[PDB]
């Protein structure tokens, strides 16, 4: 079919910059493309129609170009109310109009040391059978660090899921929190739970581990 | 503020005398609008092409310049469940609303795995040498299963396809040659052999073959979009026929306003509309029904306010001249109009305020003052 | 002005059949094409599968058969009836209005809707697990008092850390869907290390679907 | 539509008490006498009064055109029993005034014997009409029908009028008012200046009409009358039809 290779997921930008979101198609769709804007917590909205004409209600310097397969959203000026994910609609693809993957634009700030703190499961939680160890990762701008649960000098991961919160308004930082979900026998037998935090901001990866 | 106030800012005074004063003119406003239009979708070369025995071959795809017709693509949808209804360039939801210049029907039957190969910008072995679409093909490809009409047993060898072309295929190019082609360094003119073979091979259409080898009929409609006068437009729409209501009608192009009713007139089998002594449209035929309608002018009239005098009182009454009290407090129908704001007394006195056609109003004490 | 209400609701189980709606008000209902866009949590727009005025009905090759469209101009609203759904159709559905130029085919879909959420799983009872930060080996002056709410089906849930005196520290972590089918969020507070012993920061849960107010803080 | 009104209009009508060029192009003789077949090439001046009188087939064709040899288009208004064959396609003409032959009325040949077909060329438009313009099978026995076909060419479309009226046995010509209603309004864009007719005999030969009202091979009633722009006052009946008119000029 006709796919679209949009910009990568992490695209840092601040108030005032030249952001270029390129939507390249696999064929020659001419000048059939539409830009959207889906902010977190609200239905998407239309920004550019036919890849060259601004439909309505978009005066924040949203200019578009394209000839053959050359579309790009050159944003000459950014606003704090124009942040979110963008999608490209290939009109010249098929009656089932397939949209893009999504390009989110975050805010640029300084680099802070991620304050880590590992928490063993509750006392009454072990009696029920289950257990959950939490390694909290907060106040980090470079959202590219992963969590490696080092259980007794062994990478016994696979059952640990993590998620990130929304970007803060006056802090612009993220919050990561993984949950080591294991059984009761896997906790009362192991003693090393070094949460290997491989982050770009910090100089040395800190590994906090508790002892029973 | 009141009808009395309306008489005040009209006579340029603050002490209205006793009498009747016409101020405004009541006109019924047309609420709805009818766009009933004759000359609608009719016979077209669209049919007889999707339902036949054999459409064409792979290397011998036919062509039909459909024109001189009101293009109505609604008949295409009400058909058997298709296998591929992809449209490249034209939105499938606006086929009945776009005036196209020319449309060429090109039908051909290929196997199952060849349905996805035929597409603008995709190459292969059947969409590269037999029938290739350009990079600006503004048309729709329609494919469906035909395992009942072109599935003869023992292999229907009637369909052939061209292979091993000397050069690349051009948009809308006919290849009906049958010359013997060789790979190289091999004399082959009219005889075949191991490396030499005819540029055509049969298609195996048998029920034993699984998915991907069944015959599928594919027809591509090339919608040419230009600036010249179009020949195949979309079908014009037409609303319902509402009567006994002043609306906007568009019968046969003569757009007008008024109340549509039913008359006892008998038009000639060739006359459609008609005028009166003053050369004004008074009756027309129904476009899609040939019914004898009767168009009457929208209800209007003058507004007269009966004021007994500001020095006496402030109660007034309005008189809608030429109104049957149907087109918008006591209400009484008179021979001159609809009198709203007064009751008809069965007594008889001297005419104080002349209303019209014998009716007369006055400010008299009931028992109250009205 | 131009709004498309999608108050259809959905709480069926895997193997059932629900019925949604998309009612518009503010423009011509007959002279407009209605779509149905799907937005999955963590993904993009899936498909449209719109309908036309003159009986035009389209489907996707990966969704055909288990869906059917029906346009009803009587009440100026459309409906979406589907057959038995699989475990991959649990997403947020929308309905956009596709429009183009009066004499072109440049579709842009400007008029969107609101969004209907559909989930297919089983309900259970939530459980809160305390997190005591007795180890003061941190950087100093940074406490992470939290209450792990695990094993709960309904997504809408809030952890009120004494609202009014929370000092803007409640971190609402997203609900992570486990392999079993139950979510597990986190709710920590940004308080100094000296706050451990001053007052009792109760993590009062206000789970509305289960109607079970939790207690017994850390 | 007009009912019980007195409307006057200005259009290409036929003047009253005018001289109509009666042509008698008959071929019949009881003693095998030599006779001539009339076929003049009459000029066209935006009007005609073709009012022939036939029973089965006497005059079948209303070919128009100015340089109607190899350069201009045609009309082909042959109205054989099957259907109308109107066609403006470019067609290689022939100076033959007859379609196939005046004699040989046998049904062993084609239904029309299109011998005038010389060579086909590129076309521009075609109009195949199913309702034929000549509706008569000779079921009466001794009464014929009139063939009023007043034509006119306007800057827009081409108008064609026709009406069936009782033309029972009389002295010379029926003295009575007869209105003509339009049937087709096909477009046209040729600068027509002349007109040439053609005669042909149908293959469905009836019984030998030794009487005067029988075999119509020698009962031609070729009528041609040019139109002239004049004001005409029309009176409509209660049914919406025209009862009579006045010349006004």
Numbering used by the authors:
A (entry chain D): 1 to 212
B (entry chain A): 293 to 620, 640 to 678, 689 to 691
C (entry chain E): 1 to 218
D (entry chain B): 44 to 292
What does the published report state?
Only one state of XBB S–PW5-535 particles was observed, which is 3 up-RBDs with 3 PW5-535 IgGs. The cryo-EM structures of 3 up-RBDs state were determined to 2.95 Å, with the RBD and PW5-535 region locally refined to 3.40 Å. Notably, the monomer state is only observed in SARS-CoV S–PW5-535 but not in XBB S–PW5-535, implying that SARS-CoV S(2 P) itself is not as stable as XBB S (6 P). Fc region of PW5-535 is not visible due to its flexibility. In XBB S–PW5-535 complex, PW5-535 binds to a hidden epitope in RBD outside the RBM, buries a surface area of 961 Å2 and involves a total of 17 RBD residues. The R30 of CDRH1 interacts with the T531 of subdomain 1 (SD1) by the van der Waals force. The binding area of PW5-535 is larger and extends down to SD1, and the SD1 sequence is highly conserved among SARS-CoV-2 variants. This epitope may explain the broad-spectrum neutralizing activity of PW5-535.
In this study, we reported the isolation of potent and broadly neutralizing mAbs from a vaccinated donor with a special five-dose COVID-19 vaccination schedule. One mAb, named PW5-570, displayed the most potent neutralizing activity against all SARS-CoV-2 strains prior to BA.5 variant, and another three mAbs, named PW5-4, PW5-5, and PW5-535 were found to broadly neutralize all sarbecoviruses tested, including all the current SARS-CoV-2 variants, SARS-CoV, Pangolin-GD, RaTG13, WIV-1, and SHC014. Cryo-EM analysis demonstrates that these antibodies have diverse neutralization mechanisms, such as disassembling spike trimers, or binding to RBM or SD1 to affect ACE2 binding.
